[model samples]
Target chain A: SSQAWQPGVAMPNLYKMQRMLLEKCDLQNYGDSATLPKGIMMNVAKYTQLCQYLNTLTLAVPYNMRVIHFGAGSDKGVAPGTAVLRQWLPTGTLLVDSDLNDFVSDADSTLIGDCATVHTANKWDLIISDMYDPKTKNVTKENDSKEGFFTYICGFIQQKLALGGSVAIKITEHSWNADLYKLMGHFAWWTAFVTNVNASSSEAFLIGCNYLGKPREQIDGYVMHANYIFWRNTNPIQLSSYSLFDMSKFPLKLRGTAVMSLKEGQINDMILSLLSKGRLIIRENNRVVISSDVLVNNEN
Target chain B: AFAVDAAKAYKDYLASGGQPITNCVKMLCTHTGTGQAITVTPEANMDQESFGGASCCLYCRCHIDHPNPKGFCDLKGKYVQIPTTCANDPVGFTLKNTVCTVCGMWKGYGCSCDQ
Candidate 1:
């Protein structure tokens, strides 16, 4: 109904881009709500494709940016960042991939090896690791091993990740602890959040952007770079002046804001925050213990 | 099996305070065919893990001076019997802030108790 073109205006492509990308890939629906409780949920493999696509959407990308997707299967040629770079940048780049299985990839140009022992001379700009079994209900042997994997990942990230690069790691909520928070301090800004597909599935992402490499100095008694911080001791939600982030800059409070939690306040402060500004989503052992955004809307 | 003397506890709760019946937050009953009125409060039978933390009533925000065969609710009122569930509902939200001391999960926010 409106004019075709106007000054200082660009056609909205967010929805269109998703539509275009969706048609190009075989997006799989792992299961529906009916089958969720029986250990079935969304497909993390293909979901990672969409996740990376969206990740690249909001964040700016540099030319000739090296990317790596750890935990990519041996038979599957596609990397986590494959679809995004293929369509957006197309050339001058190829996604690096690795898994525990040592095998060949469908694409001859694609690299495949064991991440635990792979020797590479190159540094990466974007690193994504999605290595968890969907059936894992709680912390088990595999959950404990995630510590080693994360340690190895941080080792490489500190040394090999290019300056201003970003890293995303998928970890179960039960395994979330102070150690990860300690590691997260190294990034310029970081947030750990769970999405709809992975919410009930007990998965959360540790997304840190702009690799500072060195641990950031604590300012104002909390992680200075992060937007909001939370701590839990037993059943109490501890509150301090630093716990409630300044929401003036952010029109939409939680959006694009980094929220961090420590292992260990006031009952009134906790309740007041929940009723007034809403609370961050807190899940433990695959259950939604505390939820926000639901106070105003259905989704958080 | 004989039902525990819940009436004595209920009487004690009434004796401790000079408050109206409306002061009640929740009411509980037993599934063991005892048909006795259970005490209302956070600490009542939370240690009874076998019965899944005091298996009884949704009678939150209502009142009755004596144990009745048919109990009632305030916001979600008038039921023939006391309900036994920790699931999400009208009464569930009333106790949303109540956390399970045993499991340490907020009862209002999807604490499956089995965990």
Candidate 2:
């Protein structure tokens, strides 16, 4: 007679089943395979497939664009994937190594045109890379952690993107989990979609639209995870709103005077000069106003 | 009318190494015309007291005695000046026997006292 399968005895097998499923989905190759740390391993096939798909999309796009990779690795597999994209895409692309030095060296300058520049946390157009450690699959939670990441993304989109530009980031479901959806919700112009190329397991790829000024939450609602193609329509980021607040319209005003007593034998001339120039306009309402422009332009 | 500069007296006290007590000098008003002296003890104790039309007396002993028989002479009228010094020994001089020929009331440190 067959013995009943106890849940206790089956727990390890269940875990093994999950691991098997993960492997099938290509989630197992989250990081570099050759230098795989003790607990870190991901399915390389699925990642390669995803990168290949991205390469095709870059070729399809008409406008000149740049790809900003976030946490690229030193491994040949990772570097070559970016290199392949760079070779295929006409607009050029940048590969950012979050953990190591930039991919672009002085020797490789001729091969890599002005279309691409390898930088570490400088800025970029489309942010792509695997930021999480494959071992833990854990994302950093410090104040600057998410903020720094998002700021880079925003800054990249702002600086690099032409009119109607977009960015596509590759994040693990395990890394952001539900919060990922929440974060995507902040962008009004962004749309996200996930694709499941590996049929054996539930691995998915997310793609977001790049409407620069739109709030993030708005973008979250539109993102989808589907078959091979995860595309979201988004508008280009704009900088006109920020440029409106330059120093000309609103001049700086000094609040109060800082009196520095002069010492004997010291030049009172300097002190007098400062005092004369530092004299703020004291209004009847007892408010002291000092124009920063005046101070800057004062010859004395 | 006893005329003593309260501020000067206080300064003198301070210079002598004697700590000046607050409200040290007490003023008393006496009517020389009626010979009825109404002793007005120092009210609202002050560091200094200014004399006007009235005369101020410093209390030395419990018994209030007229210290000097010479009284101040007003330019308009001759009045007796009763001099009473502060409690300390060598009672300071109070203006007496002189009239303020210019301002009518005794003006300087002596009979011509200026309050």
Can you tell me which runs of candidate 2 are displaced by over 4 Å?
A: A1-48, A51-64, A74-78, A91-125, A138-163, A177-204, A216-300, B1-115
Q: Write the per-residue lDDT of candidate 1 for residues A77-124, one digit (tens) a residue.
A: 223223222322223433565666543221113334445565456556
Query: Looking at the true structure's interface, with contacts defined as alpha carbon pairs within 8 Å between chains A and B, what fraction does model 2 recover?
Result: 0.00
Per-residue alpha-carbon lDDT of candidate 1 for residues B1-115, written as tens digits (9 for 90 to 100): 7644443544465467733232112212122222111211111232121111111222222222213446322222111112234221223223224545555434534346765
Q: Please state the Cα-based DockQ of model 2 relative to the true two-chain complex.
A: 0.00
Worst 10 residues of 1 chain A by lDDT: A2-11
Q: What lDDT does candidate 2 reach at residue A214?
A: 32
Docking class of 2: incorrect
* Superposed model 1: Cα runs more than 4 Å off: A1-60, A74-90, A102-113, A133-146, A175-178, A217-300, B1-115
